[PDB]
Each structure stands twice: as structure tokens, then as C-alpha cells.
A paper describes a structure:
AibH1H2 has a heterotetrameric structure of AibH1 and AibH2 subunits, and each subunit has the characteristic (β/α)8-barrel (TIM-barrel) fold present in all members of the AHS. Clear electron density is observed in the crystal structures of AibH1 and AibH2, which is consistent with metal ion occupancy. A metal content analysis indicated the presence of 1.96 Fe and 0.76 Zn per AibH1H2. AibH1 contains one Zn ion coordinated by side-chains of two histidine and three carboxylate residues (Asp24H1, His26H1, His201H1, Glu255H1, and Asp328H1). The acidic residue (Asp or Glu) at this position is conserved only in AHS enzymes with binuclear centers.
All previously reported amino acid hydroxylases that form hydroxy groups on an aliphatic C–H bond belong to the Fe(II)/α-ketoglutarate-dependent dioxygenase (2OGDO) superfamily, but AibH1H2 belongs to the [name] superfamily (AHS).
Numbering used by the authors:
A (entry chain B), B (entry chain B): 10 to 66, 83 to 111, 116 to 375
C (entry chain A), D (entry chain A): 27 to 380
Write the structure that this text describes.
Amino acid sequence: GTLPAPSVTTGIVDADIHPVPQDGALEPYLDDRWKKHIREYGVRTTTGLQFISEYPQPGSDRELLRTQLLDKHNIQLGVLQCLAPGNPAGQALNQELAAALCRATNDWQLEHLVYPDPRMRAAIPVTFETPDYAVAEIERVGADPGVVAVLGTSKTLEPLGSRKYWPIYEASVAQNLPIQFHLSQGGGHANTGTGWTSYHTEYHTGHVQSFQSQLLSLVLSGTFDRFPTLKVMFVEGNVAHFAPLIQRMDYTWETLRGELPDLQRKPSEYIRDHIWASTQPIDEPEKPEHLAELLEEFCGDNVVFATDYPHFDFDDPETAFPRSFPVDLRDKILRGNGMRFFGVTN
Amino acid sequence: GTLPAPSVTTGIVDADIHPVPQDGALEPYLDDRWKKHIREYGVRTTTGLQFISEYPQPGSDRELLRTQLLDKHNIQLGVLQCLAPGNPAGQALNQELAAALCRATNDWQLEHLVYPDPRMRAAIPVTFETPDYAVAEIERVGADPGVVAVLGTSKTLEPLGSRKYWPIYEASVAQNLPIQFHLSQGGGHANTGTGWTSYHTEYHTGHVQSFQSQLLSLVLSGTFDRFPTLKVMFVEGNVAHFAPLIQRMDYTWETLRGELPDLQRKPSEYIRDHIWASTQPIDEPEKPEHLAELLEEFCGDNVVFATDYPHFDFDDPETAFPRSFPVDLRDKILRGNGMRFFGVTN
Amino acid sequence: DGVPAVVDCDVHAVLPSPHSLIPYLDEYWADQLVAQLAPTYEPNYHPRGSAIAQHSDASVDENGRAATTAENLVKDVFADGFTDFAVVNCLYGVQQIHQPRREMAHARALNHWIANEWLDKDDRLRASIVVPQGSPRAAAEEIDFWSGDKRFVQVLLLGQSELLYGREINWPIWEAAEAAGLPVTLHIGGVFRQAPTSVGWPASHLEWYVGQQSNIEAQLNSIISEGILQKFPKTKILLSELGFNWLPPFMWKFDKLWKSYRPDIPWVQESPLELIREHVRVTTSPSDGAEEAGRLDSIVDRLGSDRMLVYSSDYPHKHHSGPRDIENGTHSPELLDRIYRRNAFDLYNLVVPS
Amino acid sequence: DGVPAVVDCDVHAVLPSPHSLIPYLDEYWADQLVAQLAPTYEPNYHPRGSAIAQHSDASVDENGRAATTAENLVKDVFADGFTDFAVVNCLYGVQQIHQPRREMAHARALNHWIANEWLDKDDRLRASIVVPQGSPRAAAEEIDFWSGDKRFVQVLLLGQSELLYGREINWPIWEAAEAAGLPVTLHIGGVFRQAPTSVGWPASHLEWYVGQQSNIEAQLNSIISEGILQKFPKTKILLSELGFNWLPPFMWKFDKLWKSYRPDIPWVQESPLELIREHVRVTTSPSDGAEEAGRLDSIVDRLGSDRMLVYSSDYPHKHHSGPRDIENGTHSPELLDRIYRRNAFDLYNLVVPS
Ligand SMILES: [Cl-]
Ligand SMILES: [Cl-]
Ligand SMILES: [Fe+3]
Ligand SMILES: [Fe+3]
Ligand SMILES: [Fe+3]
Ligand SMILES: [Fe+3]
Ligand SMILES: [Zn+2]
Ligand SMILES: [Zn+2]
């Protein structure tokens, strides 16, 4: 029917909920043209595999998602991040197929979960590699009060500050929409900048790297100059490592700032109102007081909470923090910082 | 001042001339902003090297280019393909720098060689990886009667049929301009689709491969459907291997044509008026009659002659052909086919 | 003594599921399988439900898949009595397992599966050895391990490697193949640890499939230029399901630039034309239009050798032309004999049994 | 017996031109050099005319370049008398030569140049061994060759490899380093055989330079996960010119997921926290803001070890902070002693001479 604008009071933000989608779900929103195409070839992507990725590990299910997450821990805003049904959608090599699937995903998550329960709302997958489609689906649905962000991936064919993606950024914030980039495989390059990892420790910890490279590119691209309006977030990427990254950027900039004579501000200054970060999975330093220290060294105003329901490495909404974590800041990432990012009114 | 439209009569086409540019040449067309930038960092590209590439081997010089090429062999149209001064320009990682350099290259080759001698004309380098710039320089200069094609490279970050490049194709043929793609290093991927070659035999013969992959992509992209006007050419890529490629495409298409239900025509049918090919370096089969056979198996109407002056593997304009080469066809690639491609009137 | 047999040099077993390896793995890896809820490394080279995957006429199993049991392959391949032996290639993508010691372990389990459940079942089947390309010294150890079982008749490798097969890194595989008197075959498919072309990811599977001929040019150039054929001069290389019409233009440029750069690879004394005609063989399925009238006689002209082509049906894949339409391309009985029996006798020495 | 010396663990020689190797190559390679009109493999890591390339104060040569002769380096590095020994790293990109036997040959010529024209000239200099990463068995042979000359004190490797250094392929280098009692150092720079990030080519050199800390995380994760530290338990790894503030967040996630996936790498019994603190050392130049007040004492808290940091000036590069401003970050004399002399004594056993 019609929705209210997202309302945050009293209650906590979860910037990363992964809804559990059933098989017979996206076909009502999928033209036959693609249904038999998936029958014949499946969703080809950057692998040589038919089903798996590179590194392989109310009603329908609303109730299990309302009961043991949205009620268990008092969650009042949960942001819906659907990769794809049963391997992310926008990374399919057939980009026309990819667009149809996010089209279907967007329709379904709206029609089936956020409207039945406006506590949740959605970040819309778009084809970040065919910007024509990204802008087209932003205009299609990003006007809905049921859309709260654009959803991209940590891995892309070019760094996120490249100008291939600038058509998507205007579209996105010409709709007053922030963009989240969620941890991802594929993209077109190896796991690391120096090869494919072998063991699961390298794979899982390697996810941090792609975020480092994306942050640097977004800042030194001048992207947040040409888009002073733009607010982007890094999800399932581990907040703590960002602070020495940001620190090293500034220290190198001081010497080499002349290569980029257009970058209005000093790189770390761009963080203020452009770079947020989800908290899951929570960083666990050996001395637990380093966490708060590192959190505000990045930025205390730009860290949003997340569970990653229903993933195995989910964080209990307050067993996640260590012994004497600063209460002011815990409160700011549970409520205030997410509020700020998604653009709800105080 | 003002030029006549290119006029072909009596005389032979050379679709690949590499002009010999001096140091103090592009600075009159280069904003100071870039001059000191090149002083400080040089033209960074897809290497970890400061000067060399991955695989490293009238007046100013008009006279040597008029005398021993444009007069020696009666050449009446020579197409100017400047990579860059002293490593191609458009592949520079700083894409703003890259644009300025083709801007400068275009200005120089016009002001200094084609106007002083309209026998030559120019294919304008553009930044095939930042299409906004490509369209911008097409409109800037591609209207000139001194521009006869757009100039790209054999290696790109995505296959040439991708839609990243479609803004360049409309611009290009919305200016009645064909596009040449010249043999290239860099691009963003390895030498081959299965690794970096080691010895010079693999490197030099490997150049053929990138053209195979580009042809397939341009055809099965549906690109020549969405651009029924578009005429593209492959330069320094060896014509003969294309025919079994084209042949194998059709034979696989017959089985698998259902993956691409929009491709109006049968793949090899797209060659007719969309795929040309330079002849340098000439293919030398052990039995020399296989050449003509293979040449018309590709297409006898779409093969244009080239010397690659002043490169070491240049071909004498008629010591290049074997014993009893068909005279009709020799004549069609010397005069007729190039005429057809560049759009001169009969 | 003997007359060379008709050998189908490329037929396929399709692993029903990653569960079919559970009997052949250590307790440690086995538990891992059932615990990971068994990700299947089934490749996308011949997509499950595409047109190339299987024939209309093909005997199928419980779930409608062809070539998951030997009983079904044997019943189809040997029906008309013309084939004497078939060479089984199982393409299940153990090569795309990134965990090195898992790649090692599934490769061996895969080969145990082929031996016990296919080779043990029909004396008419032969197989290639799946090997963990990720770790070449372990791939060599896998080759040594099966060198005893002379029902295994070549070493399988994917058309798209991680590094080119001529790089020193990959020498143990050629040394091991040589030591065991086994040819190395490159079969279409890849590890996909980089984009499959020099210019990025192909959008369609049709684009990938056709285009994979480019990587084979790279590999032969690599293998020969780096000097595999002088270090390991008994080497034989069979190109399986990769076309063959692209070879003559490729070889002519190789020879031309060999002549130009001879001091750069001074160990290559014969021409790569002569080298390729002696050492490289290639299967006929797909024929890529060579089946069309006259085209097969002509391609042997441009190849300049009648010793290169070896017969295959690529069972159970569906191609535009069938296994024996290769005959509609030549008026030369002597050439058909070479394709059907004599050239493959160079690979395997398989004579007609009784 | 002895007191550990003040060792600058990262200073640089800049090859004047590819012609400076001509005396050290075979007749065959030498002719090749003068015949190719000598392509220079000078890297772009510190661009010739960028701000990081050299100091304003630095003694320069005929063409205005710093650090092309030992006389110029020695005169600057040892001016104020505080340094006892410096470790020379020559970054000329032989590693980016694709021709394998040329990479081999220039690497050795490079090392001959360092020995004869730098090490022979000042008993106060030491060097790392440039090695042909392309061919690891040959890189190991290069290591064995210079193991005699104990003026060569570590093995040099680029931060960005072709395959991660933990892959079996790369084991000969670690084995050779172990055998020769030499640490392996990873110095910023790369072979660039893939995009330098997981997400493509960085546009600016400033982006590349800062971002290269991501690849080092990958390498340590690789080196440790694959089990280099159990096969070769005497291994020491020095991270040169790569920052160090990124380590604690990295190590904490490693430890967290080690604890999660312990049966996947069952040879890693100690925690990667303990492993990294024992085996990895890192130079101080650039300090990346650790020079700022209090920041250096704090980073050793987050690293949880005072044994890791070793002093370097990165001569002749220009950084925001100078070699000794590292002192403005701690109120701990005991920690400065560890950085300036004691931690590097773990790498080289260099005591103060007389
Ligand atoms: Cl609370
Ligand atoms: Cl004539
Ligand atoms: Fe998540
Ligand atoms: Fe997750
Ligand atoms: Fe050329
Ligand atoms: Fe050329
Ligand atoms: Zn096959
Ligand atoms: Zn350094």
C-alpha cells in the first residue's frame, strides 16, 4: 500500500540482515525469457563453476526473522542485504540477466518482507558494472520509501572511485540514497592484489583488503568532491584496520600530495561525512581497550551496528562489546550513527 | 586552413603508418598543469616500470616520411597511428592525463603532418576506458576532414563488445567515423588468457590472441545489431587466423545459439560490413597458395593493406605477396577495400 | 605385432555428485565433505542444461543425466561396434579447489573413482589421470602413483592454467609424464584464476567456449619456446575438444617469428612447424566445419601433416556434426585410416584385441 | 661476546642505467643489452622525479640523482656517526623481466654490481640478495651462490608477487633462505603480473603506494597458513618500507579466524599472534604517524611485542617524518634501544666493531 518513512527511536539499527529466500520466490517477477535461460545455463559468473563460488564455505520465513532477531534483541531498523537466491546477482557475466535478477530481488524483498513488516527496509542490488542499468533501477525503485540504500559489492572490476561508477553515484544521491558495499567474492580479479589465497584463514581475513583498496580509491579519486552529497558504507569489512590505513594515507599524502593537485581536502578529512562502517564481525584485540581507541581513531560518528543474521559469525547485540567499552560510543553505534547514515530524522 | 575530403584513385592505401615524433612536439598543445605533472611522475600505466612497457623489444621528419614511403611506393592514403611520444597514450592510469595527451597528439598530427601533406590522414587516439572523454574528443576533432578513424587498442579492460564502450561507438559513427584497433600491450590483464608469456616468440605471436577474443566479443555482443552503422578494423593482428576462428564460432553457434536469443544474424554474417583487417605482417603459409584461400575465407572485401612504417617487420608493397597471388584480390586490398573502409567516394 | 585399434580419444564421465568421492577419501577429508554440506565443484564448461551437454539419444540415469555410470556410457559408445577403446576424461573441477591439500586429495579420490567404478567395469575403457595442477610437485606425485596402472593412458590438463605450462614451475608434470610414458592432454576448461582472455571475462558461455582456442595457442607457444620438447623429448601432447582449424595460421606465425628470434630460444633447433607436427595431436570432435565437403582434406594440407588428427566422439556432448561426419570432408580412405586408428597408435599403442 | 650495532635495515642503491650491468654478464647477454638499445627496468615504486624519490639535502651525482654511487650513499648515511651498518636494497626491476633466463642473468649481474661496487667499497655496508622470483628453483640457486659472502644478509622479495609466497611453488626460496641462515625481506614494489589490488589498477602512484599494505597482509596470511613457519622454523621475515600500523588489526582477525578454522591448517599449533611476534620484523621508515606524540608506545601495545620494530632511514627516500623522529612517539628509552640495535640483532648478529 504505502509506507511511513523509516522511524528510529528507542531502538537499535542493524545494518546487515540476510533474508532467507525460498526457491519459488522470484519467478513471479521474472520474465519467462530469463526463466528458461536460467534453466539452460544458470547464473554464469566469474567462476568456472556451475553452482558454487570461488571459496565455498506472517509466513514464508518472516516469522523466524521477526521472532529470533527483530524481537529477541529489540531491533527497530534492520537493513536487508540479499546477495541472490539459491552467489551475488549483479556479478553475473550476462549483465542483462543480472539486471533482471536485481529487478526481481527488489520487487520480492519489497512486496514480501519490508511492507509486511516496515521494521526492516532494503538496500537494492544494482549492476554496479553496467551503470546504465544501475541508474535505471535506482529511478525505478529508489524513489520508494521502502528503499533506504543502494547495494553494491566489495569487489569490482575497477576501483570504486573510478569514473565508470560516477553515473551510479549521482543517480544514487540524486535520490537521497546512501550506498552500502557488502563483502564479496568475484569482481574480476584475484582474492588479493598478489594472488589467490589457499586456506580459509587467508580467504576470510583477505576480505579486509578489498575494503582498504576501495576506501583509498574513493577518497583520492576526488569522488567526494564531485559528489559532496555522497555517503557510502563498508559492510562485513571490519572497522578497526581502517584507522591505520587512513593514518598511512595522510602521512604519504603530506609528501606526495602534488600528484593529485585537485583533491580539495586532506584525505582523512573526507571521512567525516562520507565513510561509514558496519561493526560485524566485531574486532577482538588482545587488550580489549584497544577497540574503543581504534574505533574513534577511524571515526566514532561513522560506525553502525550489524548482526549478520543468520550467518555463523553473528554478534549478540551486546555480548559483542568488551569489558569496559565506552557506553556513550556503544550507544552512538547502536542508535545514533545508523540514524545519521540512513537519513532518518531525529 | 581547410582540407579536401580524402581522395583515393590510381593509388594504394596504407592503413598503418607510425609517424616519428620529436621530443619538443606536444608541449605547445599541453597545459602547464600536465607538463610539470609528467616531470614529476611520468606517464604511469599498467606496468611497474618507469619508462618501458611489459615487453620492450617540409621539415621535422615529414621528408623522410614522404620520400621513402609516400613516394617510394606510390602511396596515396596513409593512415596515421601514433601510439604516443617518447607506450600508448590512452592506457595511462591517470585518465585525465591520458585525455590531455591524445588531445595534444590529435592537435599535433593534424597541425604538423596531415595538413602539410593531405596524402596522410589520422586515426585519433581516444581514452577507450573513460568513454566520457572518448565521446568528448570525437566531437572535438572527429568532425575534421583531417580525421578518418577513431584509434583504439587490441587490449582493453573489458571485451570490446561490452557496453562500457557503446557510448564511444555511437559518437564514432554518429560522426561517420570507422574505428581501428591497433596491436597493443597493457590493457589490465595478462598477455594471454592463461598467463604472461616469457619468450619473444610467445609475446609477438600472442598478439593474435587478443584480436580473436575481441572479434568474438564484438560479434556475439550484438554490437553490430545495436550499431548497424559501425565499421571496425583489426590492425597488425594477422588476417589469416581469423577465418578458422569465424568458422568455429558458427559451428558452435549452431548448437548453442539459444544462449543469445537476440543475435539477429548468424555470427559470420556480421563480418560483411563490420570487420576489416590490416595485412601487416603478411601471413606466410608453407604452401603459398593457402594465403589467398584463407584471405577470402575470412572476407575478400574487408582486408586492407598496411606497411607498418617504419617498424622492422614492414612489408614492401608488392614483395609481400607470394608467387601466383590472385591479381584481382591483391588489387582489392591495395585500393578497393581500404577505400570502402575509410568511406571515400569511388 | 598388431593392427592399431579404433580409439575414441575423448569421452567423458560425469561425477554424479561430490558425494561419490566420500568412499575414497581419508577420514579427515571425508568428514570435511559431509560437514561442508558438500559444495559440488561441477564445472561450467558444458552447462548441465545447455544444448552441448548431452545428446537427445543418450542413455540417461535416474535424474536424466548422461554419462554418470559406465553402464550408460559403455552402452552408447560401443553400440554400433565400431569403437575398440575409449579414453575417459572426467572434468569435475578439482582443479578449481583453492585449498591445495584438498585439491590434492579430491584429485586422487576422483582417480580412484574412475579406476574402481569405470576402468574395473569394462576392459574397453581407458582414462586420463586427473592431477592437482595447483601444486605441480604433487601433480607429479599423482602421476607417479598411477604410472603402475597402465589402464591410465595420458595426463589430463585444463586448457587454461594458472601459469603457462612451459614455465619451469610446471616442469615436474612434463618430467613425470615423460617418465611414465604418458602423453599430456590439454582439454578445454580452466582454473579461472585470471580472466579467460587477454581482454577480460567473456559474457556468454558461447563466447568462452569458442574463444578458448586462443589459450591453446599460448600454451603450445609456451611449451615449445621454454624448451619442454628438448628437456623431455618423448613428450606427446594431445589437444582434446579444442578444435584444430586454428593451428595452421598459428604455426605459420610461430615459424616466421622463430626464424626472426632464433637466438632468443637457442635450444629450439628444429622449426616449430616440424616440432608441432611431431609432438602435438588433436581430437576431431568438434570438427568446426572440417566435416563440410573438402574441408578436411584441405586442413591437412594447411597443417602439412597427416599424423596429427586423432578420432573422437566427445561423448556425450552434442556438436553440430557427429563423430563420423568427419568423413564428409575427404575423398581419401588413407587419411581416414590414419585418423581412426593409426595416429592414436602414437599416443597409446592400443592394438585390436580378441 | 658483543653489543648489538645500530643497523639501518633499509637503504637503497639506484642502478645508474642498465649499462652498469654490462661488465657482469656473459658475452651472450651483454651483446643482447647493447643490441636491444638497453631498455631500463627502472621501477616506478619511487618515481624518478617525485617528492618521495630523494631528499633535498642528499648528495647527488652528475645527473642530479642520489644514491647511484656508494661514495654518495656512505657520505650521507654515516655523516653524523650514529649508524654502524646499513643494509642495501637495490630495487632495479629485474623481477619484472618476463624472459626467465634474462631475469636469472640480470639478477646475478645486479648482485655482482652490489658486491664489487658497493660492498667492496665500505665495510660498513651490507646487502640483500636480488633473486629471480620468476623461477623459484633459480632464485634458490642464486641464494646458494651468495651464501658464501656473508656481507649479504637477507633475501629480497617484492611485496607483490606472482603467486603468494606461501604456495609450494615458492618453497625453494624459504628453504634456501633457511639453509643460508638468511632472513627474507618483503620490500614494497611488485612484479605487476596482476592488478595490484583485488579490485583493479590504482590510478595514482599515491594510491598504489599507500595501498600496498594490503598485499603484505595477504603474504603473511599465506606464508603462515601454508606452513612456511613449520617447515622452515628458523625463518625470519623483515618487512621493509611497508608501514607497520596496519599489523595489530590484521593479526587480531588472523588469530580470531585461526581459532575458528584450526582443523583446516592443523600444522599451525601456536597462535599467529605468537607466530607473527616471533618471526616477522619491520622497518620504521615510513613511520606513518607513529612518530606523533605517544603513537609509538601505543603501537607496540597493539602489536603486543617490543621485538618487532627495527630502525631504518629508507635513504634516500623523503618521508613526512625523518629517520629519528620515531623518538617523538615514546617516553621509553628501553624501547628505543630495542629499535635501534637489539631487534635487528635478531636478523643479522651485527655487533659494534672497532
Ligand atoms: Cl542497552
Ligand atoms: Cl601494381
Ligand atoms: Fe553480511
Ligand atoms: Fe557474513
Ligand atoms: Fe602498427
Ligand atoms: Fe608494428
Ligand atoms: Zn571433451
Ligand atoms: Zn625502502
